Design a protein around this nucleic acid. Structure first.
Lengths: 152, 257, 168, 145
RNA sequence: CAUCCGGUCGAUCCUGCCGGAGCGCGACGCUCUCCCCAAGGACGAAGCCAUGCAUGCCCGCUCACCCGGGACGCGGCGGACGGCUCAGGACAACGGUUGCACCCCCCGCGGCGGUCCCUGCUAGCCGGACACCGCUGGCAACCCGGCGCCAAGACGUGCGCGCACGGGCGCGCGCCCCGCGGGCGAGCAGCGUGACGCAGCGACGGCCCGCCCGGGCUUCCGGGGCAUCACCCGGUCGGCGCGGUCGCGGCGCGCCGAGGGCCCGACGCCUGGCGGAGAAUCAGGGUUCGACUCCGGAGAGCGGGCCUGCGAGACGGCCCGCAC
RNA sequence: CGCUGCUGCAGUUGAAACGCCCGUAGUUGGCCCCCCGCCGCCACGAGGAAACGGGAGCGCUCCAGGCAGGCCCGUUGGCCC
């Protein structure tokens, strides 16, 4: 409850009218376990976050390529920048040149994310202009583990 | 790009049709229908070029303009109507019956069959759809559209007479299976194994009769009899003749020539 | 000439993109048909627009009335439809009385007044049923589908929304 | 396309004008000869009221015709001048008993294909429902185990 | 598929580049006895065009004609395919790889096939309403007028079974999670339940479904030069509520924040920049070139804007601004 | 033409080590744990048009050609890219 938020948010998948009674057939959130062996997080099961873009508790369905990368930026609300380190082989000189590709990922409040951590992203129908990827798992690291160009 | 293309160039044409590069700017184009464009061969070529019955492309249209040729027991006359895999094609004027099969190199071959062989048709089961007002339905490799205990990939022996399910060849390890697509088309072997990977492109491992474990994609796999071919196999039994075994055959052919 | 083509948008790096093509028919956009609440009905003109592949869409431009449902008692009835109260995106749209899904509206209680006789059927809809107007939000895309059905507001959306508009 | 304005002006090279109510003193050219109307009605519904049969309404009248009779005027191609080929509009909107049979054939066919489908659904309904209970006959054994 | 020689001095040995030596592919000069095969107005002018041609095919109706010979118009299908050329376009196009649980798709192929009405019905199956064609006329031309009449497997209307039914609804699985299907790797489907609409097609049943053939986009990696371009962008970057679209999306709009990019070269600028399949030259590695055959793009003097259609933002369609 | 140098060029004096030093990116980092986890890496598949390059078979009278031909692999036109 607030006076500043302009529009009320709920889950289309849940029913607001249902919450008024019948404390038996009652469900807090319409969350479903993701496929590709993805465990639904417990914070997500017991989570009061509307998140229409949540992979676990929202309309978003994960289908397509699933990648793993580091956390570069997280200034955006409900969005993080995933730096994807990778190597490019040159044939004229048999050496590899290091490259970096930043990818935008929508993050659910169930994921608590800090910079220097490593996230496992997954493909989504484009959520925004730069976001076609959603986070399905977040792995933290102690403090800042330097960088070290890791193509995860 | 504007609208649908209605031409197929000769260089664009798939290699299996084996249409000569010169002598023709463009090959014939199949019609949208039971089989796909690279999954089917043209009916005109099967009579005009493969059998040499029609001297010109137009005079193949003349032959079926008056009904004279049938595919899957139905007149199916159109000249460029797609004629694809396990098709019962019969010329009643010639009094001959031919299943359209895949050769070991991979090209299509018309192989003569018995009237009992003409009695049934083999088609793979595509994924069951739940449409048409909740009536369960499933499609074939020939697009034809049920029995509840059936899954995708299994082959139904549609009669073409009953137009109904008959002997269903369930997809399980050890069934004698044909390969529809990939480099080793035409080869026949029991499926040694399957690795799904719970993602896509399930791996297929196939032990052949001679102990060579050939492989392909799981979609390109055709069942040919739950037990035994249950079809008229062209005399190669999918043995995969090698390039040298093919040179032997060619050199004896030249000796006979 | 309206288009949703991405060519006319700048890149993530704020960079101008070379225009490789003239606007194409597939990426076309059409004028927003603003469904307009008739208010007193003392006309529902719903247009029909040709789409891609010879399909059809119904464009509501002026209409009153429409199916509504009381989810708590699960009874569904047509309702007269009164003025739009709240638009959640604009305060002008409410006064203009344009109809779009998510716009909360008042409805006559006379069809759904049959539940005043019943008791303990919630309390909020009981007081709206007693009153001339019922708080309800639209659940249908009036412009694309051509109908403006809705659900009578029940429980938390109604609690937050009442606080948002009614008190002064 | 350029168009002249509907209100007439002296400028127009020509105009066109049609009698709405005819006056007296009939004109030598404008009012006197009714150009023979041709193109005789082909519609059966038109024929029913045109040939004194409107009262018959739905009826097997079959053949009533008024026709031009000056040979055919194309008998020079036949090369026989002395012939009188009928000059008639082919009847339109004609109803035949084959038309009635065609309606009955397709109505029987529509009913037949619909009926076969209805009975078949009940047969499949048994297969699925019995199969779920038949699966129960199997699930008995693990509980015994 | 690994090769040099001539040129700095009085001579010498070096470095160093000059010139030869072979090939390709265009001009250019001189000459060519044939036969075969064969590129051909791309090359800083996607400049401009006289002339003729490049998309018709059939009747669904035939009352003229005149024996089904059958024009003329309407009617159906095709005219978006095909041919042409690389102007534009430098995280784009194009290629491999993906996704549509974010979708559209005529023909054809294999199937389903209850269509409410109050009623109003002619449903042994209906209307009115026009071309054509007469009959008078304009205009220098182009182009059309009015009159009168009659057709269609044209069009408009119309019975038709409440598992009537297109749509869009409101409501219908869950107990930390993870393992059976009509299913899938995954809450996807298809309905039951309560409303609304009266959509189609129906005057010779198709409503509709799938397969498929293409699209529409999308994932990942590849994807010119320039620092005498070091800082950029401001719907730009996220979120939210709507619209809009075949559909996802700043795709448009309000609202709310403060992002998003960069010495692993961003942004800016330039390009006598189509891209790849490929081509030329060649030990190996490289280098060089991608007009044209195949594919994918993009355009039809230049900008826009459009209806028809199953599909074109079409130019051998239309409309307008700008040239000529 | 190893006169562009990854293979594979030179900088004392022929052209050329910044006058010197700290220094951030960048690049490079002694050994050392066998035994898995992600890397990269390497091999092996699968799937994704040909023409084209190669190449089997073949007397266009020879050839550049072409996928033809012959009393026939189920005649061929494989197979690789």
């Amino acid at each position: 409850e607030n006076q500043h938020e302009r529009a009320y948010h709920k889950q289309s998948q849940i029913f607001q009218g249902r919450f008024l009674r019948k404390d038996n057939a009652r469900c807090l959130r319409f969350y479903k376990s993701i496929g590709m062996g993805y465990h639904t997080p417990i914070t997500a099961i017991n989570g009061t976050y509307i998140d229409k873009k949540c992979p676990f508790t929202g309309n978003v369905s994960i289908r397509g390529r699933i990648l793993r990368g580091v956390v570069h930026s997280a200034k955006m609300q409900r969005s993080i920048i995933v730096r994807r380190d990778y190597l490019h082989f040159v044939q004229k000189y048999k050496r590899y040149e290091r490259r970096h590709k930043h990818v935008a990922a929508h993050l659910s409040p169930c994921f608590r994310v800090k910079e220097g951590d490593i996230v496992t992203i997954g493909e989504c129908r484009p959520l925004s202009k730069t976001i076609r990827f959603n986070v399905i798992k977040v792995e933290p690291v102690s403090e800042a583990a330097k960088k070290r160009f890791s193509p995860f | 790009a504007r609208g649908v293309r209605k031409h197929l160039k000769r260089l664009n044409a798939p290699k299996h049709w084996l249409l000569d590069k010169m002598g023709g700017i463009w090959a014939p184009r199949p019609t949208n229908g039971p089989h796909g464009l690279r999954e089917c061969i043209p009916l005109i070529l099967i009579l005009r070029n493969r059998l040499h019955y029609a001297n010109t492309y137009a005079e193949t249209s003349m032959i079926l303009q008056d009904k004279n040729v049938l595919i899957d027991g139905k007149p199916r006359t159109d000249p460029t109507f797609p004629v694809g895999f396990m098709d019962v094609f019969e010329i009643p004027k010639v009094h001959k019956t031919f299943r359209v099969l895949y050769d070991v190199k991979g090209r299509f071959t018309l192989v003569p069959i018995q009237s009992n062989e003409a009695g049934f048709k083999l088609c793979r089961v595509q994924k069951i759809f739940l449409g048409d007002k909740g009536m369960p339905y499933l499609s074939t490799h020939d697009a034809r559209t049920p029995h509840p205990d059936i899954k995708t990939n299994d082959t139904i022996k549609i009669n073409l007479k009953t137009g109904k399910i008959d002997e269903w060849y369930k997809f399980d390890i050890g069934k004698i299976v044909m390969v529809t697509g990939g480099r080793n088309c035409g080869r026949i072997g029991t499926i040694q194994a399957i690795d799904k990977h719970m993602g896509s492109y399930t791996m297929i491992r196939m032990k052949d009769t001679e102990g060579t474990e050939f492989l392909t994609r799981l979609c390109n796999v055709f069942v040919i009899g739950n037990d035994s071919p249950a079809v008229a196999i062209p005399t190669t039994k999918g043995i995969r003749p090698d390039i040298i075994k093919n040179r032997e055959l060619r050199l004896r052919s030249i000796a006979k020539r | 000439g309206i288009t949703h083509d991405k060519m006319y948008k700048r890149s993530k790096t704020g960079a101008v993109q070379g225009k490789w093509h003239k606007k194409r028919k597939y990426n076309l956009g059409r004028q927003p048909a603003n469904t307009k609440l008739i208010v007193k009905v003392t006309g529902q003109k719903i247009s029909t627009i040709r789409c891609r592949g010879g399909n059809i869409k119904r464009r509501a431009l002026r209409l009153s009335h429409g199916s509504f449902a009381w989810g708590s008692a699960d009874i569904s009835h047509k309702a007269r439809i009164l003025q739009v109260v709240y638009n959640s995106t604009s305060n002008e749209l409410v006064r203009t009385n344009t109809l779009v899904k998510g716009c909360v509206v008042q409805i006559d209680s006379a069809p759904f007044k049959s539940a005043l006789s019943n008791d303990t059927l919630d309390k909020e809809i009981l007081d709206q049923i007693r009153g001339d107007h019922i708080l309800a939000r639209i659940s249908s895309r009036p412009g694309q589908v051509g109908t403006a059905d809705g659900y009578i507001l029940e429980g938390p959306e109604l609690l937050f929304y009442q606080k948002k508009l009614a008190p002064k | 396309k350029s168009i002249r304005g509907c209100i007439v002006g002296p400028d127009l090279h020509a105009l066109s004008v049609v009698l709405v109510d005819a006056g007296d003193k009939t004109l030598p050219g404008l009012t006197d000869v009714v150009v023979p109307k041709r193109l005789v009605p082909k519609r059966a519904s038109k024929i029913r009221r045109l040939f004194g049969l409107p009262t018959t309404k739905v009826d097997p009248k079959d053949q009533m015709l008024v026709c031009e009779l000056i040979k055919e005027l194309g008998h020079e191609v036949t090369l026989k001048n002395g012939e009188k080929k009928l000059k008639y509009p082919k009847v339109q909107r004609v109803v035949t008993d084959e038309k009635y049979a065609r309606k009955q054939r397709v109505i029987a066919e529509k009913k037949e294909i619909m009926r076969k489908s209805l009975q078949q659904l009940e047969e499949y309904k048994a297969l699925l429902s019995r199969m779920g209970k038949q699966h129960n006959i199997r699930i008995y054994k693990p509980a015994k185990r």
